[PDB]
Amino acid sequence: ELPPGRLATTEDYFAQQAKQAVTPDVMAQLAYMNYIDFISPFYSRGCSFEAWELKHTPQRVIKYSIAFYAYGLASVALIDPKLRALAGHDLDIAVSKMKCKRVWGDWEEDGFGTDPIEKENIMYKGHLNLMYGLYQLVTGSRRYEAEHAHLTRIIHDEIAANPFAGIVCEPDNYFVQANSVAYLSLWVYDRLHGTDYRAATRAWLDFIQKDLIDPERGAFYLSYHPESGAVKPWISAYTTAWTLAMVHGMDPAFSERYYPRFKQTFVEVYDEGRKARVRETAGTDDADGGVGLASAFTLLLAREMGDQQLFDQLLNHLEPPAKPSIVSASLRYEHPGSLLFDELLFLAKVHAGFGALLRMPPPA
Amino acid sequence: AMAELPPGRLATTEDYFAQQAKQAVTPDVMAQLAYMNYIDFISPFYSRGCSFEAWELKHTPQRVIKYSIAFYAYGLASVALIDPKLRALAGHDLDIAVSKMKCKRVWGDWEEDGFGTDPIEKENIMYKGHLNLMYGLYQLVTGSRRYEAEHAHLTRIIHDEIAANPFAGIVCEPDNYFVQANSVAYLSLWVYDRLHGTDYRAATRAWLDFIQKDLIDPERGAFYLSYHPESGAVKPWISAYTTAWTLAMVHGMDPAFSERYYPRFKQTFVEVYDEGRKARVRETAGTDDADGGVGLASAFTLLLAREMGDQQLFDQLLNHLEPPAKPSIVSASLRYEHPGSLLFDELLFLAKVHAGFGALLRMPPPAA
Amino acid sequence: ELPPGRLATTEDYFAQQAKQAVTPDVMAQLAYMNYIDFISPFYSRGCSFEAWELKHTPQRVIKYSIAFYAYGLASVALIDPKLRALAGHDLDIAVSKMKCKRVWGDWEEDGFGTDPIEKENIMYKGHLNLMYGLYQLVTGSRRYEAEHAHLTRIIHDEIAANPFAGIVCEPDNYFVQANSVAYLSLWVYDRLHGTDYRAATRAWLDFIQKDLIDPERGAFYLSYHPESGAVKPWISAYTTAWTLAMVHGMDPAFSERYYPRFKQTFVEVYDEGRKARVRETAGTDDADGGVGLASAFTLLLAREMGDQQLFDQLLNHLEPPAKPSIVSASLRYEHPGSLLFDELLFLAKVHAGFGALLRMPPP
Amino acid sequence: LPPGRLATTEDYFAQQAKQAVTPDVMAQLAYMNYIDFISPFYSRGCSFEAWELKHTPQRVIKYSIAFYAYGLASVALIDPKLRALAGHDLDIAVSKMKCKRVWGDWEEDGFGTDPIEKENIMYKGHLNLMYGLYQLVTGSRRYEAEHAHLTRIIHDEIAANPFAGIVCEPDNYFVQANSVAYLSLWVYDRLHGTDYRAATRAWLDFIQKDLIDPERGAFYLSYHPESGAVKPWISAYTTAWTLAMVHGMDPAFSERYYPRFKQTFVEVYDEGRKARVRETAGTDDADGGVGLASAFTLLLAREMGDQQLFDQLLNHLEPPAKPSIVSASLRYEHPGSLLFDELLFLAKVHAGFGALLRMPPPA
Amino acid sequence: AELPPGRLATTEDYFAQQAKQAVTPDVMAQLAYMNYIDFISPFYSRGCSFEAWELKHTPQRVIKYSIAFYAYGLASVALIDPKLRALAGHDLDIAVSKMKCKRVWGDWEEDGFGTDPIEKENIMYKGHLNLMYGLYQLVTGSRRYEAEHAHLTRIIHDEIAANPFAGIVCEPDNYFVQANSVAYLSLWVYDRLHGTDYRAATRAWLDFIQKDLIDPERGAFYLSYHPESGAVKPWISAYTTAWTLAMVHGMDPAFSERYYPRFKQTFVEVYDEGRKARVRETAGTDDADGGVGLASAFTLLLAREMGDQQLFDQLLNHLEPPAKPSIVSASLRYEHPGSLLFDELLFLAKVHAGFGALLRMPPP
């Protein structure tokens, strides 16, 4: 029923919404996130990052950690209405910390500018914009509404000005997965305000199927560089898994077309069908190369696509070697196997689908 | 059992509970006062200056220094009641405690976290609640008006913030409300009223009604971890160290409140073990693990057992906490080889001397 | 025939341009250079040097690392038209990083000035000027054309003002290899613009064949110091190998004359003809003394001169002990034997010749 | 000599009669003076390498300089041929004592930017005694204006206070720090024919109330005038230092308490050969607290003329510290306390604080 | 002549270099260490870069001595081999440039003595700088530093004229005979270049240092003099005496010839059946090379200055073999240098032509 190192069944994770209750291990993760003074990640809105120092999070990855926690908390709010207020509180803290210079300051240290939202920098500010929207869908609070409208207009105006569809992270550095976050943030703003910023999405989905995708492999190239026209000629599994998951919330048929191809290209089923692991690129047998996140993002994609078999296989690969334990009702891993480990396992366990988040029942 | 001395214990529970009646501290309490006061530069109460070598040597985290100073101060106030011959020394140490508490090393996390340059103007009640209680206890012990103008100013900030808030009490930064931090601030208003004949303590009844209605699970006798008034969230876990601290301070203001919940608190959290000889405290529900979270459930429950007059539980807890830390006396000064938690020597000192918060509130004026 | 411990045969490297495809290990090197967020050397145009921190590159060597990667990327553009846009993008990043104060700021820290291009400093600004030109040959982009024109004129004007042929790196410190880069940059500017800045080259080639070369040994002296007149009395293999490789792009006959003499002076064939290693100076049997780059620059010169036998012998010496491996389609060395290791083995495996780069067809 | 003793007690006590320091005292002066840059008395500049090498804590440097200075003043009385050297070293001691490395804890702790304006009597009492001893040894008026200014600050602060003496900070009064300040007034009066010392009788009357246990011959650790507190532990090092300096001003005072002090704190052991000093009551442990009870008792035994206890204490202190003489300079491999070489030097030479007050004028 | 165990070349070979007009191969390998490798060789650049000294762990306060002793050796290379004179001049230009950098003189300001290291006092620094200016111009004929040389020579002349004792202090109350020896020799060199008579002050100084500063029977100087107190530190010093007698031999040969045999009896220990020698730093000890640890190395320079081939051989047999020299790629390294300034002082003693020969160097 449960192999060593698994805490709950795949059936149990997929049934949380129908039961209106998170699993006990998800509650223990929420306790890790919230319980201990000063050192839990969601203790305070202040510019303190002790939880991330303790996990040895690299500075450039903090912005991804906060965002992926926020996306998981939005699904907790949909699963269990009794945890919606807590999830809203944690989302307020997530937005507050995301705005701290420890999180965005690499933009200035690299020489690109003193203001991280004014131009470009869509990985940072796409996540921030999606977070502002999810906070307001969950709580009904207008605390960040003026900032949200301002950043949504920046994103709209940059897309409208560019001859390619979307926005760069820096001059000649375009990433499809960073764009996927920014476009989903426009769908959320439209849900809140009755606007049509999402009308830009069709041009983007047409553009990314042109030279940014390998159609036979169902896989995006690593990056695009508009000034040279270059596409870096390696396909990327973690890039593809993230992008197809977010796109499925905006154009389900797009992701349904490429998902089986993606699986054939990258996913290695092993141990008699019990486990799976994901190769990061073509022309290798090695799993989880590059940034080391192909299997963890494919676990999120399997959840988004409703693929219980692949979800179970990947969590059987990822969770047992990391040695979970529950101490004083809080979850810890002795041997996290990647960056963003507890963040991505939490998000995949609770994820209700990006379309379900867009359609979240309005706040009491 | 209260007159037995287990291995790793320095004085009996009977001896600690008899100190006020005998008008003398135990020898190990005196040896703790020697640790606190004796060696130049490195003892914690050597000087009023902004020097923290004693805390560097113990590896105290910056955010915990304010609690270390405050818990030492609360124990020093009880030393003043136990032995009139030590009351002047306790007053001198309280002056140093207040002076160090005002140093930016102690409060400066407020500014580093981005909340402001002034740690008392608004919010921040754990820091400024302890500072306000310290100002009051210093003046009750000494009769000195050295800090009276600052005490009046901070008492009025606290009074005005309570009056302005729609919930009863003050936050620790927007949407972060802690019952234990508020308990300190309310007790500080009782002390100001004792010194000045005022009625700032009239706010207390609305606060006790609010925390009993909304923030306690009355059947378990246990408070929830925290309240977040903007979102309305209550973090849905009960906390033993939060509850032990809050019930101990509340017992000084409304004894009946803490007497109602104390037996239920013990059933919820306290594990008696070793054939009744020892006890250890679980931090939350749904676990068998002792002293999770911040690791202070047993140490705060030792203070609560002293406040409630529960000699049996005090003995059990001290039998769990003290022997593994390996106390000894060297050159008439107390040392521990293996302190078991943050705030270890501070909380064991406080629990060994504690006269009760009601007795501190009523401290008779000093001899001329 | 694949020699032990090698990734590809010498025949395979020399056939890349005819096959219009890089070898799989060259592609794996391009993956190392480009793939991983933040830590790959060609991730961003920003002033971030994590890739160089992870390799323990000394500050003073970063400028050479960037330039030698750039020179290899220009040959990738000629080998495979389908990788020309990638090579162009990487060259844009290389120019951007080369202008960062982390790269040039030793000039100011040493006390020489706040502006690294206005005078002297030809190793830095010679490489930057060659990189501006190669970027524009590969891409057709005029992004850096005004900066290129400005720096080409500074180089022209300094050559015209000096009584010796060329430019110093600081007062009394003249290096033939740094001048070779600067002169090659004038040939590239002339290819792009139809100018005649290269007309200064003949006076320079005449000058360096006086007190700066031992013509019998085919070897340059370490350095010249025009204020004292001093020539440092040691011959240098890495100085000679670099200089003869770049000179072969401007005056092939010069390098054809000295190359066999250079090999007799410095090159030790060993292991029954299978391997070779290069002595850095005369009067020693030790290989790869000094900066430790004689064998690696001789690998580049063997490629420039079309010498497949010596190329094979040197790569059999250099590559196996460094323990290459390919993980997730990206190349790593466990034990690089020198500074600039992956840069110089990359450049020598792809190098099409400096004259072929000069004559690169438009995009 | 028993292992780790360098000279007999008879030899130390006979130095003034022989007009010569012992060879180990000369080897200590060589440690103090010989090696460029790293000897403590090499230069008058604000360099503290000797103290960095001994790991002296910042707050202890002011005591180290002062105790060296007090030993140098006795060297000047022992051997007229070393009086000029002792004066030169005293000039450097005063110069270094004024450096912010030495006094700057006053500002870092938040008490003020001026270390002499008010309070801070441990620092400025030692500085004022040093100014006086420098002028007694040399006849130089180099520091006379500064000496007059600081003497007047001390006189005016004593006159303003309702308790007898001066605090180190508000509510922190130390009898041993006051003993230094009062002795500095006796030295100023010897030099100038003034009567600043008239304050001494009120101070000796005051410290024999709540600050001393007369039956034990022991001072309490500290007094806190704002609260009235006297810390309730007696202190051996505090008592030994205070009785030694007081014996120079009121010999009868120290003679009254010295036998009681010895009964309270001194343990003779090893068949009468050794002695060691407990720091407080209610312990069998020697040298607790700051770890200086035995070393200050060695100074007190010298001041009181107690050759037996001096020998017993030096037999305890010196051998385990493993002295040796290398190139005519004294080193200790295992100093047992802070201020170790300073206090053993001072006790070996000390002529008595009254003898320093009566020092004949220079030749 | 037989090569003693562990030596690179015979004493006969070092003493024959000037007559043969060629340096020995190990001296050439030392010049290669000094000049060959980019960035890390000490004489690579005129810039304020000290990597060579960082690699040897040279203390900051000793850098000024390292540069000066290299410079004095280079001046003798110029006399030994006309073909190396231009190289020696180039290296001397770099030596002067580096000597002027704040890393070299800045202890003067850090210790609190002033912002200008030449205006007054500080004769060890500025005496060496002044001698280096002169030797640079004798070797090259270059007037690059002539204005600075004239300025510093006048400062030294004016300070000697103002003082009631003969010479200049390092700091107030600290007078060192060896530091003064350098400053006086610098006046002889300025006079050789300019036909002036700044050297006229030398006789008063030689008279002065033969009073309380010398033990005439032992042929040994006291460690230091302190004019404000009148103190003379009561220990005689071998390294002080060896350096002073070497430089004085270039100005008053008879002075050093008088005291040299006495100095040897006082301090020099011959051992190993006459094969080796080592030098005691002070009286009243059997220990060799106490204090700063340079008595044997400075006595090797003095043996060379005085033409004493037997003592030179004995001292080099003591100093060089245990330091484990080797030649790698034609460049000299020591595995175990025995003291500060080790490769500098062995280089200088191996080439030294005599301070009188340097003073009278024939033109380029």
From Swiss-Prot, chain C:
Location of the protein in the cell: Periplasm
Disulfide linkage: 47-100, 169-178
Keyword field: Disulfide bond, Isomerase, Lyase, Periplasm, Signal
pH dependence per the entry: Optimum pH is 9.0 for the linalool dehydratase activity.
Further comment: Requires DTT as a reducing agent for full activity in vitro.
Subunit composition and interactions: Homotetramer. Homopentamer.
Name the UniProt record assigns to this protein: Linalool dehydratase/isomerase
Organism: Castellaniella defragrans (strain DSM 12143 / CCUG 39792 / 65Phen) (Alcaligenes defragrans)
Annotated gene: ldi
Curated annotation (Swiss-Prot), chain D:
Expression induction: By monoterpenes such as limonene, myrcene and alpha-phellandrene, but not by acetate.
GO BP, one annotated term: monoterpenoid metabolic process
Inhibition and activation profile: Is inhibited by molecular oxygen, high salt concentrations (NaCl, KCl, or MgCl(2)), urea, and Ti(III)citrate. Activity is not affected by EDTA.
Effect of residue 168 to A/S: Loss of activity
Note: Requires DTT as a reducing agent for full activity in vitro.
Protein's gene: ldi
Cystine connections: 46-99, 168-177
Functional pH dependence: Optimum pH is 9.0 for the linalool dehydratase activity.
The protein's annotated pathway: Terpene metabolism; monoterpene degradation
GO molecular function: hydro-lyase activity; intramolecular hydroxytransferase activity
Any matching Pfam family: Ldi
Known outcome of mutating residue 126 to A: Significant decrease in activity for beta-myrcene hydration, dehydration of linalool and geraniol isomerization
Outcome of swapping residue 46 to S: Loss of activity
Residues reported in the UniProt entry to bind (2E)-geraniol: 168
Impact after mutating residue 99 to S: Loss of activity
One GO cellular component term: periplasmic space
Protein name per Swiss-Prot or TrEMBL: Linalool dehydratase/isomerase
Active site as annotated: 36 (proton donor/acceptor)
